[PDB]
Structure formats: structure tokens, C-alpha cells
Amino acid sequence: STAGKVIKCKAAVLWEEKKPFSIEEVEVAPPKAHEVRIKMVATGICRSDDHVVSGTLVTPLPVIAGHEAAGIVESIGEGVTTVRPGDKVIPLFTPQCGKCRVCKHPEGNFCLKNDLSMPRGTMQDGTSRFTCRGKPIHHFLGTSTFSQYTVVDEISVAKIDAASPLEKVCLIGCGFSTGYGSAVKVAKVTQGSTCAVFGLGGVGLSVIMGCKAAGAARIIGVDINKDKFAKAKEVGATECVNPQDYKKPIQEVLTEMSNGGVDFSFEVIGRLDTMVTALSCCQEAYGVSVIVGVPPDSQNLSMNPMLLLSGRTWKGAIFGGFKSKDSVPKLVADFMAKKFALDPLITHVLPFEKINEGFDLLRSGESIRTILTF
Amino acid sequence: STAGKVIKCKAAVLWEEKKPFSIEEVEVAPPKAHEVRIKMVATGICRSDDHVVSGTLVTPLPVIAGHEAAGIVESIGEGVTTVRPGDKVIPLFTPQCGKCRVCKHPEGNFCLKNDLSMPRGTMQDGTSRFTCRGKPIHHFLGTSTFSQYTVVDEISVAKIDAASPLEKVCLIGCGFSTGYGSAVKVAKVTQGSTCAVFGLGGVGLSVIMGCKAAGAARIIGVDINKDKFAKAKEVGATECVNPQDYKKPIQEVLTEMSNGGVDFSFEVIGRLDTMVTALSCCQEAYGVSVIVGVPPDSQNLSMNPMLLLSGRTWKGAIFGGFKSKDSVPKLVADFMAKKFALDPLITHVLPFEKINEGFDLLRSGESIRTILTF
Ligand SMILES: NC(=O)c1ccc[n+]([C@@H]2O[C@H](COP(=O)([O-])OP(=O)(O)OC[C@H]3O[C@@H](n4cnc5c(N)ncnc54)[C@H](O)[C@@H]3O)[C@@H](O)[C@H]2O)c1
Ligand SMILES: NC(=O)c1ccc[n+]([C@@H]2O[C@H](COP(=O)([O-])OP(=O)(O)OC[C@H]3O[C@@H](n4cnc5c(N)ncnc54)[C@H](O)[C@@H]3O)[C@@H](O)[C@H]2O)c1
């Protein structure tokens, strides 16, 4: 038994930007009141974890990154009521405290307890559960899933089906739910509509799944890597375009293709210029454009407000608009009943020890999701 | 008798930017097929008319401006079926052709036959019905209401109640409908919400009327001219703030006052900086901001897309989102049935000959709407 004791285990520590992860021993403290210690089973490699390495997404270093994962509860702190030792669980990078104005709002999901807007890299109490080489190490979004064991606040974990396959449902912790919800919840795509999806990685493929589920007649995938097109078509794209093949800006191309602009567009990359292009390719009077990609830290975009004055709607969202703790168990149940597929997103499987190879695969263009197993 | 003949009458011509209007004789051609010639009875002075004078809003010069008006049909061209000589009518600066993809959409109103996006200053057939001192003169938004007589395309006129008071219902042609619709149709303000309204002229006052009719609990008016506050409170504002009274940026003040951000905000001025402030002051996870003011020609705003990623919605609209020809007669009928008031908007009534005095009243801060009577 390890309950009440420090655990020594392996983790992937990031000591410096623009360097490989270091796989080495860390010390993981036992959970305090209203905290949960989790044995990790599987974790996905998402572009947002890479953004921590590149300095795109700023959070304090040194850090244990990872936010898309699933595992098994090892122990619970005083007062925990919503999970027990042995339960299967998904960590929630967006918490659901249930008590703030956002949690109480029908449409709100970006709980005020989040660590994303002004990242601190701690537990809710302002302290760390991790030591490495005798030094404190920061958490990431209250999750820190690149470790054999992590500690999370109770508002940042959801219990899931005991029969769930953790090497697949790890993707419900971020990329699948984000893209799917961006289409069906945030945009509210309509039957018979025309959609344009910018970026065909794991998150953009999940947006396509949601647009198909909503009954779109046309789903136009957009990527500068034409090797992404075959899988985009398998999951529902009706056509794909590469901006580098055209002499005109792709907003003009897409306006022509859609006979005056698309109904719904999605930016699923993280670039200023494609956020403005995606806006402008939606129909000027009634179009909707959703920003999903994470922008470069502290950088502003330039746009003409006449794009909005004619009637366009521009919005963004975290985690597909889903209230996290309510939604994750229901999404897992839907997956168990075959309402959506996760296999199309999983291109590579590696042991956790080969994390750096998994990041190489993402950076080269060759992977969608690599799943790491502990 | 004038039917079929050229009419010589008085108009206010703008020969070049940054000059007073010239009140002098013009010649008005008879209506061609599918056109309507109107005897003007009353026209309002809107800030958009002033933006033509200042070069804020680019349209071809020389021009007959004016777009917020009411009059009586003098004659009709071949093929007109929707109005007849003697009818009371309002000019529609946004047409409703009924045949384009925007008119057929349930939520679109910015008809593709409009002359706002790329102004040419003519009738639909690409020609002008006006001459002055032997020179052709441009039309403005297919209306040109600063003239004793104008000619409009059939898609740019609506028939209204024969008993309506034209000196009041002229405001349904632009400023009332726009502000009121921006609240009740575009934002869809909810019962119990907190709203912030930037700019307390005729259009912003009409936004306040709409927020109050929608049941908002709190309506915060924002203006640098404190003389605007008393009337804003009479029509529904619960509090007013002047940015110049505060050491901190007003987005921070309004976030504090609303215990974390407002539900709905409206930019009703036309400035890049207040568009970004208005978006920022709405709650980051579920807030909605609507741009109503007309921006400076060709200028781009700068903003951080993280304002949208957290969950805000940003939109704009023309004419309050109302389909123009369907809506204008219904709004007149609703005024006749006492469903809303127009008198709070009207501070001055002058003969048409005093047009320049009316614009100097607007520019000095001393008026809301001046109504000019022919
Ligand atoms: N809003 C949220 O809650 C949330 C959650 C998930 C991920 N993210 C963000 O979503 C984005 C996508 O994540 P992912 O894991 O799918 O990433 P990814 O890198 O696998 O996919 C991005 C795709 O964009 C393409 N691309 C790059 N530059 C392009 C350009 N100029 N034009 C067109 N295509 C271009 C790439 O070739 C790639 O296929 C990232 O920015 C990530 O940080 C946001
Ligand atoms: N979208 C549409 O269809 C539509 C229709 C109506 C008019 N317009 C636009 O709406 C806007 C308002 O028109 P109006 O006739 O009510 O104008 P107005 O000038 O009477 O009112 C604008 C108000 O803004 C205030 N103001 C100016 N600068 C400010 C600042 N920096 N901060 C705070 N307050 C400030 C003024 O003191 C004034 O009371 C104009 O830009 C006009 O062109 C748009």
C-alpha cells in the first residue's frame, strides 16, 4: 500500500524551452483534503503540449506537462466524495467547481478556477505536489499527465465507466471533445450547411466528425500539408484545398467555391492570419466563425471591423464549450455505445519512455495522435 | 401636375467634403420601370450623414445625402406593384429584393443589392435621377432624402399606415430600428441581465429602450458628454459613467461594477478603441458584444484573440438585423399601438432650410435627433 506515503516514480520533466523532455525520477506527495492521486494509464500528445516547449503557450518552468489522459485512482484525500480508489478517471484541464458565476450559467464552461488565463502552475492551494532532484516542479493546467502518478484537485477529475478502454478514451480529455463540441455546441452547425475547417490534425478531424454528425452537406478541409487530406475525407470532408496551390488568397477561393461565403468556419491551427482568413470566408451577413487554435502568447491580430458590421458572428471556446465534469462521463458512455469513433485519430502507439520520439512524429507532420502507455 | 415630367425642386447638395450643405434648385427625373418618386415630408439628421461630410464614410461626391425619412408617393414607374400614388412610405437604406441568398435566409438582412459595402451612388441600373447646375449628382444608399423629391428603386421603399405621423415615424427608417433591433434581435438581451451601452445619441438611446423592453436588470450608459446622462436615465439607464472621470481604463471599471463582466455590451459610437473596450468589458466565458457604430474608412483595429478563445461572442449588424421591407411597416404599426415611444429621441424640430443649423446642433453635442420638415 502507498496510501498516505510519498511515491517515487518516473515523469517527463521540461527544464527549459526548446529542449527534449527529461525522463527521470520525481517524488509525488500524497493528496491533501479534496485532492486525488492517480496512477496514469495512457496520455495523448496534443499540439498544446508542444506549445509549452516552443513558448507559444506560456506557463511557469520547470514543469510536468500533459493534459489529455486517463488513469486509475490510487488514493483520495480527506473529504473527497465523487471518486474512490480503483475508479477509472479522466483529469479535467478545465475545472468545474460548480459554485462560480460561469458554472451556474447555462452556456458557460470556462470555470473561474482555471489555470489557463494567467498560468501559476500549482494546485488550487498555490502549492506543488512534485519534487525532482530536490527542487520544486510546476503543475500544468491542474493536470500534469506526463507522469506515472499525478495529484489533481477534485474539481479537476471525472469518474468514467469501469469498462472503458483507457488507451482510446484518453482523447475525450482534450482533442476529440474540443473539436466535436466546437461544431455541435459552440457553432451549432445546421443540417444542409456548408462548413470550412482550417487545420486537419486531431482537433480539426474531430470538428469534421461533429459537422458530419450535425448533417452538413459540404465540409471543406483546409491544410498546407496535403498528406492530411486522405484521413479528412475518411471522417467526412467532401473536398480538401491546400492554400499553397492557389494564386489568390484562400478566403477568396472559399467564397467562390461556396457561391458567396460559407455558413460555418473553424480556425483549428493557432495562427493570427488564419483566424482573420477563417472569419472573412464566412458569409458576410449570416456567417459564423469559431476560433479553436491557441494563439502565440501576448500577440494581437489586425482586422477590419466592417467584417463584423455586415452581420458576421465571431466566437471562440475552450474544450468545445463543454462543462467538463458533467460532460466527460456522458461522452465516454456515448463512445461505449458507438455514437462516435476514436480509432481514426490514433496513428501511432509508443511506450511513455519514447515520449521524445512521439513529439518528433508530431513536429514532422507524420502523426495525428500518438498515444503513450505507462 | 408632375407625373411623367422632370420636377425642379429644392435640395441640400454636398459638393465636396468638409463644407456646409448647399440649398439650391435640382432637377429630378421621372421614375423608370420599377422605380418610385417620393415627395419628402420629414427627415432626421443622423451621425452617418455627418460621416459623409467628414470623410469617415466614403461615398461618391457630389451627392444628395439623407437616409432616415418619411414621405408620400408622387408617381410610380412601369411594373411597380407594392406602392401607389398618395401612399405614405419610408425609404429603405438597406434594400429587401426577396430573391438573393441573404433575403431567403431566416437570420440575414444585409441584402446583396445594398450600396453600402462598395458604394457607387446610383440607382440599381447604374444611373442617376438628379442634376444640379447641369451636372449629374450621386444618390446615397439608394435613398437621398435631403431633397423635396427623390426617386428610389421599388426594393428600397415600404408602404406604411396612412394615419401615421411622418414627423415622428421618420426615425423608424434608421436610428430607432437600428438601436432597438441591435438589443432585441441581434444580441437577444435576456431578462435579469446586465448591459453596457457605449454612446448615448439617438441610436444608443434606442439600444437602451430595447434592453429595457427585453427585461434587463441593469443598463450602464457610457459617454464622454455628461449632458447625455439625464435622458439616458429617463429611457431606462440605471447608472451612467464618463471614462474621463476615471484614472483606470473604463473596461476595468465596468468589469468591477458588474462583479466580473457584463452579459451584453454595445458599441454605438464608431471608434476602433471603444469597439475593443466594449468587447473586453463583457464576461470572458459567456459575454456578447455587438458593434453598431460605423468605423473610420479603411482602418483596422488591433485585439488579442484570447478575448474570444475564453468564450466571448462578437458580432455586428446593419439596421438592427431587421429585414427592411418586412419589418418597417410592422414597426410603424407597433408605434401606433403604443408599444414604444419616439418623442424621447426628438430634441429639435426645424424647417428643411435650416439643415446646416441642424448639423451644427449635432456636432456641438446639444441635440439627439433634429427632425427637418419640408
Ligand atoms: N480551444 C481549446 O480548448 C483547445 C483544445 C485543443 C487544442 N487546442 C489547439 O488547437 C490547435 C490544433 O491542435 P492539434 O493537436 O490538432 O494540432 P496539429 O498540429 O496536429 O494540427 C494543426 C494542423 O494545421 C496545419 N497548418 C499549419 N499551418 C497552417 C497554415 N498556415 N494553413 C493551413 N493549415 C496549417 C498543420 O499542417 C496541421 O495539420 C492547436 O493550436 C492547439 O493548441 C485548443
Ligand atoms: N449599423 C447601422 O446600421 C447604423 C445605423 C445608425 C447609425 N450608425 C452609426 O451609429 C453611430 C451612432 O449614431 P448616432 O446618430 O447615435 O450618433 P451621435 O453622435 O448622436 O451619438 C454618439 C455618442 O457617442 C459619444 N462619444 C463620442 N466619442 C466617444 C468616446 N470616445 N467615448 C465615449 N462616448 C463617445 C458622443 O458624445 C455621442 O453622444 C454612428 O457611428 C453612426 O454612423 C449605424
Q: Which ligand is nearest to the CA of A226?
A: 1
CA distances from A67 to A75, A171, B226, B252, B274 (A): 20, 10, 50, 32, 37
Give me the phi and psi of A198, to 5 degrees please. -95, 115
Q: Candidates B172, B203, B208: which one to mutate for ligand 2, based on the most atoms within 8 Å of Cβ?
A: B203
User: In angstroms, what is the resolution?
Assistant: 1.0
Residues 6+ apart with CB under 8 A from A348: A358, A361, A367, A369, A370, A371
d(CA B127, CA B29) in angstroms, rounded, equals 11
Grid coordinates belonging to B343: 418623442
Does the distance separating the beta carbons of A285 and B102 come in below 8 Å? yes
Distance A48 CA to ligand 1 centre (A): 9
Ligand 1 atom 27: the closest Cα is on which residue?
A: A269
Output the CA B69–ligand 2 centroid distance in Å.
19
**What residues are paired with A12 via a beta bridge?**
A23
| Domains of chain A by start residue, with CATH | 1-178+318-374 (3.90.180.10), 179-317 (3.40.50.720)
The answer to whether the beta carbons of residues B67 and B92 sit under 8 Å apart is: no
Residue that is written with C-alpha cell 426617386 in the block? B151
Cβ burial A68-99 (10 Å sphere, 16+ → b, else e):
bbbbebbbbbeebeebeeebbbbbbbbbbbee
Q: Where are the alpha helices (DSSP H) in A217-369?
A: 229-235, 250-257, 272-281, 306-309, 324-336, 355-364
Please list, residue by residue across A39-56, b when 16 or more beta carbons sit within 10 angstroms of its beta carbon and e when fewer do: bbbbbbbbbbbebbbeeb
The DSSP string of A78-121 is: TT--S--TT-EEEE-SS---S-SHHHHSSS----TT-SSSS---
Nearest to A63 by CA among A28, A35, A21: A21
Q: Between chains, do B305 and A108 touch, taking CB under 8 Å as contact?
A: no
Strands in B135-137's sheet, in edge-to-edge order, are B7-13, B22-28, B130-132, B135-137
Please give the Cα distance from B209 to B197 (Å, whole number): 11
The three-class DSSP label of residue B212 is helix
Q: Which residues have a Cβ under 8 Å from the Cβ of B161 and sit 6 or more positions away?
A: B88, B329, B332, B333, B336
3-state secondary structure of A122: coil
Q: Is B240 a catalytic residue?
A: no
User: Which residue among the candidates B170, B174, B195, B211 is catalytic per the annotation?
Assistant: B174
Compute the distance between CA of residue B147 and CA of residue A82 in angstroms, rounded to an integer. Answer: 73
Ligand 2 centroid – CA B216 distance (Å): 22
* Torsion angle, alpha carbons of B243, B246, B247, B248, to 10: -60
Closest by CA position to A67, among listed A143, A158, A118: A143
Query: Which chain A residues are closer than 8 Å to B318 by Cβ?
Result: 309-311
Cβ(B265)–Cβ(B278) below 8 Å: yes
CA distances in angstroms from B281 to B126, B199, B274, B286, listed in the order given: 44, 15, 10, 12
Amino acid making up residue B96: Q
Cell of B326: 418586412
Q: Are β-strands A35-44 and A69-76 bridged in parallel, bridged antiparallel, or unpaired?
A: antiparallel
Interface test with B, best of A185, A275, A309, A324 (most B CBs within 10 A): A309
The answer on whether A293 is annotated among ligand-binding residues is: yes
Q: How far apart are CA A350 and CA A366, in angstroms?
A: 14
Tell me, what DSSP letter sits at residue B295?
Answer: P
Torsion of CA A242, A247, A252, A253, to 10 degrees: -40
Interior/surface letters A259-280, b for 16+ CB within 10 angstroms, e for the rest: eebbbbbbbbbbbbebbbbbbb
Cell 448639423, located at residue: B359
Torsion of CA A174, B314, B297, B294, to 10 degrees: 180
Cell of A274: 488564419
Backbone phi, then psi, for A294, in 5-degree steps? -85, 125
Ligand nearest to the CA of A205: 1
Ligand 2 pocket test, pick from B94, B265, B268 with the greatest ligand atom count within 8 Å of Cβ, gives B268
Q: How far apart are CA B259 and CA A103, in angstroms?
A: 15
Joined together, the cell numbers standing for residue B22 give 448647399
Across the interface, of B272, B286, B291, the residue whose CB is closest to A107 is B286
CA-wise closest residue to A107 among B370, B302, B263: B263
Q: Residue B293 and residue B100: Cα distance in Å, rounded? A: 26
Q: How far apart are CA A7 and CA A178, in angstroms?
A: 33
Nearest CA to ligand 2 atom 3: B318
What is the rounded distance in angstroms from the CA atom of residue B4 to the CA atom of residue B29?
Answer: 8
> What number of C-beta contacts closer than 8 Å exist between A and B?
128
B72 three-state secondary structure: strand
Residue contact A110–B311, C-beta within 8 A = yes
d(CA B262, CA B241): 14
Identify the nearest ligand to the CA of B231 by its number. 2
Cα distance between residue B39 and residue B8, in whole Å: 12
Measured between alpha carbons, how far is residue A157 from residues A127, B201, B373 in Å?
18, 50, 68
Distance of CA B267 to the CA centre of its chain: 14
Catalytic residue among A147, A156, A170, A174: A174
Within a 10 A sphere around the Cβ of B336, how many other Cβ atoms? 14
Say if residue B231 is exposed, middle or buried (CB neighbours under 10 Å; 0-12, 13-18, 19+): middle
Query: For residue B182, which atom of ligand 2 is closest to its CA?
Result: 1
CA distances to B60, B111, B293 from B120, in Å: 6, 16, 21
DSSP B14: B
Q: Which residue of B has its CA nearest to A118?
A: B306
Sign of the CA dihedral running A47, A48, A54, A57: positive
DSSP string, A11-71: EEEB-STTS--EEEEEEEPPP-TTEEEEEEEEEE--HHHHHHHHTSS---SSB----SEEE
Separation CA A272–CA B317 (nearest Å): 24
- Rounded to 5°, angle at Cα A327 from A291 and A84: 135
CA angle B155, B159, B165 (to 5 degrees): 135
Q: Looking at ligand 2, which atom is closest to the CA of residue B368?
A: 20
Cβ neighbours of A284 in B, within 8 Å: 110, 117
